[PDB]
């Protein structure tokens, strides 16, 4: 039978699995869309 | 059973001492063979007179061949058939070269359009239409115009092999 | 399949030999088997069948 | 050689092993007929082991024949062996398992003298 009281789910199912990242340096998955008219430039930087 | 022939079936009641020479009733029956033709004869004689096969006899069964089996004819057919919810009378027109072929077309068409099985069809009448202006259905009328001619667009050619090397055409 | 009208493999229900192990009775049976095969007298067949019977089927005379 | 015989047909060369003798060690291969009420073997469902039947019986003209065409007669001594003296093309002598080696030598010599084939001439040979 039904829950008898509605509640939102606990936690976000889009951040699964809650495993260890394969590297200590997180991967950059998407870069900004290229604007070929602009001067050449880095789209990201590294730091601590 | 649509390898149809036409038979004349003539039969009668069995002669008795008080009534010799009964009245020799005759029917025209479309059927695949003589056994079915005699069955249909007794079916209709039972349904219209008080004569069953046990009290009667088939005097003659003869196959009637089309007199001019190689000239295109317009045929008017009257049928009565049984639907799922009642009995109906129908008139149809078939353009074809012989009576048996018209009746074959009739059975196929009644099966296709009304789901009427052979069991469910009585062919009341098949008669050649003597002349035009008596044809009343447009699907027959449109083939009776002057200088008729039409193409057959989109020809599909049979291929004997699994793979073709040419990406075929439908010209005709 | 066959629609059997009678029981299959049915033994005739008659003794074809004496049940006894008397060798002399068996020699008598051999004699009358030969006699009933090689003569047409029904007497020999009757005697041969009578030689098969049990004690209760041969009451004293 | 032996008497000429028709070709030997066995009709079932495969041992009839008891059901689940490959499943449980406690069930021996010696054939037993399943008598359970639900047994698929007894009910002869497709894909199961076959059961021994009288239909598999050997042709009576080749039954008991060895592939050489001889019937086997077990012999324990020379006197047993001469019982096959006049029957060398239908019977072959087999020396019993419990005959000593020095007696097997004598049996083999007599069999070679009389023409009797011996099925196991190599048993207990000394070297």
């Amino acid at each position: 039978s039904h829950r008898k009281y509605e509640a939102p789910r606990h936690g976000h199912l889009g951040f699964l699995p809650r495993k260890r990242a394969a590297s200590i340096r997180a991967r950059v998955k998407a870069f900004p869309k290229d604007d070929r008219s602009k001067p050449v430039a880095l789209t990201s930087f590294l730091g601590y | 059973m649509a390898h149809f022939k036409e038979y004349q079936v003539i039969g009668r009641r069995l002669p008795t001492e008080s009534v010799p020479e009964p009245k020799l009733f005759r029917m025209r029956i479309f059927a695949s063979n003589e056994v079915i033709a005699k069955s249909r004869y007794w079916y209709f004689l039972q349904k219209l007179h008080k004569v069953k096969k046990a009290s009667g006899e088939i005097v003659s069964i003869n196959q009637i061949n089309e007199a001019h089996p190689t000239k295109v004819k317009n045929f008017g057919v009257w049928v009565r058939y049984d639907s799922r919810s009642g009995t109906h009378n129908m008139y149809k027109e078939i353009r074809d070269v012989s009576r048996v072929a018209a009746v074959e077309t009739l059975y196929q068409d009644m099966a296709a359009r009304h789901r009427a099985r052979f069991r469910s069809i009585h062919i009341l009448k098949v008669a050649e239409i003597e002349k035009t202006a008596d044809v009343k259905r447009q699907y027959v009328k449109q083939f009776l115009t002057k200088d008729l001619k039409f193409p057959l667009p989109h020809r599909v050619q049979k291929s004997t092999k699994t793979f073709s090397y040419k990406r075929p055409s439908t010209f005709y | 399949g066959i629609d059997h009208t009678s029981k299959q493999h049915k033994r005739s229900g008659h003794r074809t030999a004496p049940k006894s192990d008397n060798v002399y009775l068996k020699l008598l049976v051999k004699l009358y088997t030969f006699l009933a095969r090689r003569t047409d007298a029904p007497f020999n067949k009757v005697v041969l069948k009578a030689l098969f019977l049990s004690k209760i089927n041969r009451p004293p005379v | 050689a032996s008497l000429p015989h028709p070709k030997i047909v066995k009709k079932h060369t495969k041992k009839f092993k008891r059901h689940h003798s490959d499943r449980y060690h406690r069930v021996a291969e010696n054939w037993r007929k399943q008598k359970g009420i639900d047994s698929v073997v007894r009910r002869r469902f497709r894909g199961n082991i076959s059961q021994p039947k009288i239909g598999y019986g050997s042709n009576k003209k080749t039954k008991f024949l060895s592939p050489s065409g001889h019937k086997t007669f077990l012999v324990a001594n020379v006197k047993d062996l001469e019982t096959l003296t006049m029957h060398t093309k239908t019977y072959a002598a087999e020396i019993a398992h419990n005959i000593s080696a020095k007696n097997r030598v004598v049996i083999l010599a007599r069999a070679k003298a009389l023409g009797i084939k011996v099925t196991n001439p190599k048993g207990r040979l000394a070297l």
């Binding site: - | 291929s159 699994t162 090397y165 | - | -």
Partner: protein, 197 residues
Amino acid sequence: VEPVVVIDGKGHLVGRLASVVAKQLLNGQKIVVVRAEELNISGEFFRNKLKYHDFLRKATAFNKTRGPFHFRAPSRIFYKALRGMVSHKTARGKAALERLKVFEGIPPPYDKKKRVVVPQALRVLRLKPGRKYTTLGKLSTSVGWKYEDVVAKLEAKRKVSSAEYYAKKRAFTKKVASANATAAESDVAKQLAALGY
């Protein structure tokens, strides 16, 4: 009869092509299918998209990563159709499936090899004119395939290069036909015509 048969999937109906290819592979013929994105399915696009969404909802409830997988590429949709027509769970089915390659577009080395058609699976020969049909590439893009544009660009490049090949081929075959015709009506030509050549 060829060691490898390369099938141009453009204009074929997916299920009839799948049935033909499955029987070929099961009978031991090697098949490479190119231009899977140009395959056809009978019925309107919205109808086939509804069918694929109904496919998409089927998944193992307690773990979706083990449920039925929903491949979006046109070549994998056709491969899915080929499964179900091959008993893929047997060793013989795995061998028949290993005899098969399916591609979007025509990659090398097949871009320089002859492509054939399967007339019993050709839409133009099979579907009644006026019946709606679906294009596999657009259906795949709608259900989440990512590479329709790059395939179209790269196929345009292959088509221009192929057109240059064909113009050269036309020149050579016209030369050969004219020189053959010049050498016709000679004694050998007369005798070969008498023999049927």
